[PDB]
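Inputs:
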Amino acid sequence: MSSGKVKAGELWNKSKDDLTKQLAELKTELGQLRIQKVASSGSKLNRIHDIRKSIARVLTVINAKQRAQLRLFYKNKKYAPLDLRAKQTRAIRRRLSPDEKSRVLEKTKKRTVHFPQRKFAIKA
Amino acid sequence: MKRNPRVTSSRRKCRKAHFTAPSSVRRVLMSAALSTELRHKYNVRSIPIRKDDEVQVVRGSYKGREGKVVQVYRRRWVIHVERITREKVNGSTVNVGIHPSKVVVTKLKLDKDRKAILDRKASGRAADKA
Amino acid sequence: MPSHKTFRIKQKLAKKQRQNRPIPYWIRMRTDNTIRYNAKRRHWRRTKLGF
Amino acid sequence: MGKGTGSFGKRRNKTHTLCVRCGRRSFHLQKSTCSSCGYPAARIRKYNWSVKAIRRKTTGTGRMRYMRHVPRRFKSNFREGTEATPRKRAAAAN
Amino acid sequence: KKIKAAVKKMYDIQAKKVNTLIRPDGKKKAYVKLTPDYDALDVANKIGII
RNA sequence: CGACUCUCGGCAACGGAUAUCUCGGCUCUCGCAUCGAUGAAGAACGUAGCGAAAUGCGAUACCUGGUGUGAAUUGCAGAAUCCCGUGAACCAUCGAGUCUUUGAACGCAAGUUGCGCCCGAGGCCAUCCGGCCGAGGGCACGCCUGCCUGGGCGUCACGC
RNA sequence: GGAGGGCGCGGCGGCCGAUGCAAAACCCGGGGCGCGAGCCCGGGCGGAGCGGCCGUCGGUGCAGAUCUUGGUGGUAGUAGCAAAUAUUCAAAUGAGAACUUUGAAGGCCGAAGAGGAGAAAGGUUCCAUGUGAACGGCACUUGCACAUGGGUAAGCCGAUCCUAAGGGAAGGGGUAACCCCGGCAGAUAGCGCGAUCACGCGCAUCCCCGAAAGGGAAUCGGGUUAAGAUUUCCCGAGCCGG
RNA sequence: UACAGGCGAGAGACCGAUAGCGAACAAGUACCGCGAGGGAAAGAUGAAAAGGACUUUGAAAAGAGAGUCAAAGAGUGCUUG
RNA sequence: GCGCGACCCCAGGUCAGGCGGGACUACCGCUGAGUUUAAGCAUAUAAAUAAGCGGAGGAGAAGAAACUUACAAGGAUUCCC
């Protein structure tokens, strides 16, 4: 085109089925603007940058949709090779999350274990 | 130098930030002194401008020109106003950059988000004064 | 035989040939000001390109 | 004939060739090793006697680093906010 | 193989050969020999080429 | 007797010192914790309308979603809906993304865009409900845990 | 060589002065002061900050160092630009032609070539078009220069495939480790073939790289552009593998 | 208790373009070397390009007029020189 | 044979997951010079330092006495005086 096409919130308000048809058209349209790149047309000028952004938008949103459905299926069970990646950011933080301190003092010396001042006094 | 544990204070740093101006930096440095009529309406001495404003040269040699702000330039922090010009040798007329401090705001486009700036700063000036 | 065919060298030759192009006039205005006299344009007869 | 002139003139053998890993002509072909990073090699070649100039080359400057930096900065891994939607929301504060 | 399929999809023509050239650009130039049954000249007009 | 040889001044040319500048360096001090096979550090080669470079990015390619700000970007061109606005901007934020080819680099090698193997679906037609072809992504070392077919008078019972 | 008393510069605490109506800086066969270190003042140049005085402090004063770094002489318009058998005439073009380009002429290498191509190497240098700022130690309108464009298409040629000398994962073992020999309980640990049917049968020194020269699955002819053409293209004819 | 890296800050009787880091500028860049490695030179027109139209000479580069500028004794050899 | 459990020892491109490299300023280990100094030089000095190698974190190491002492006994570990 000569104008930019569309806005990201519009694509959010469209179905997954709708946007994949749009994606096909954007790729076809891009090839036209690539031959016009040589021409140096005023039509392709703005447009050839912006069409790549349009392609990017539809691809991002569809992927996000798939992850959401997957998570709802997975949360009941024991799960995630995919969502596990996001949760951690792995190795150093992974070693630090057993939860050590609470577990050690879960058994042996816990009935009287701390300073009073209040708490033991309030609750008797 | 003068007091306080804070982020910002360094003669070099002050220069560094304002020359290359990120967007928030641009808008606060785009604050141009109001004319006296406008000062008593919005109860502030200075506000960030626009492009559909009209702005009058007070300070310079070029004094007495008025025009709308055609463009604002980030990279070297300058603003460009209509009819403040110098003539090239061939007879072409090219705008001469003016600092927003030098120029004084004749007329405002209120907008909606720019309008919000007026309200918050006005509230600010009310609190100290009374 | 070919004239060393290996892709790793071949890609570098393509890249350096593209790189050895003059600075394009316009950009000297859109840098503010500072003499953009490239430097990474080399000529084959003098020096030698390392891989 | 002898030295210099005859030393230069032959040169039809190759030893140090392009390394894939570091992009430097330093790959010793007939002993299949790079002398600038190690090409087959479990560890990258690091020397702490090889001083100022060389160390900085291996420190790099074609680096990413920024992508890595953002997780350090937040420390969390979430956030949530979708304000600025027709209503006029909560998208202009104070 | 892939390019012959792609040409068939997008311009509805049979391709008889594809020929591959490295360029100093760092991308690949393709000379694609087309069918005589639908002539390259009248393929050309709708994706114009000089 | 010019001239020559020499010298100086005045004006210059030469040259880039000096002065005055400095979005930089330098050194000290303070706060902060936070990389990776979930594909790193580092490289390569591409992508901007017009770019050699730097910077940015990766076939979703000087960028995307979302969000903040609220109108610029500019060398020129350009879009005019994106301008009283779910929204301008080499913008900031950037939670949701793609993230090429490589690289610890993992199918196996690599002076090879080298050579295998496996699986996916769509279409075909039934020399079979199979054959053929398609696009994508896997298949390493290491060892735990659980697992199967078992080696073996390893040990016991029970065999004919 | 010691001690003594001073001068000049940079910055800092104090104090006082000076300025776009012309600061600092710089120039000055211009004046004057001090024994000197230095200072003072004028005129010219210049265009934004600076100096004096009292304390404080140094990366604090230069002529050298076969000094370091930058500039510039005399040398010197001097040695030279002398190997390779050698040029010349007319025309074209252009502002300008011993050298460009075309003809004519004279020659030269003398087919182990000063040749037509490939290797290796370089990397676009090839060719067109533009064209003389730098560069071709003369010249120059010419260039292997600079600018702007284009160009390398393969079932059959090579690489690939394959082994060699040899290299190197895997095992065991030293060596913290890097790293090095190199295979082991792949030997009643599984790779290979029937085989579609799930089951049986058979076997090691493995397995890859290693000559773009060894060894080798398979093409010829004509035409074409700037060019190598079995090779690009095309006709006609094949040939090999699936 | 440590801290010449990294990230984000505050300062100094710090340095002032042959100084300061190798690098104020495209710098670990250009370039050098077979490699290990070695490694520069290079900041300043002006308030604003107002970067000298036009006329004239010259093959052109340039010059001379003029225009512009507070100043060309500021013309991208650019402040002082 | 077949040995229910299992005993002992192998094999999965095996089920869910985990390791290498970096950083290496600072730190924790390992391993380890010589120039130099002694106006020579070996013992010694430099130095239980530089080089070499591995591994973590924001701190790390250390850590509640088979201690120090010789006292009306002190009392994990670290750092400063």
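Residues 33-42, 47-48, 50 of chain C lie near RNA strand H (CB under 10 Å from a C1'). Flag for discussion at group meeting.
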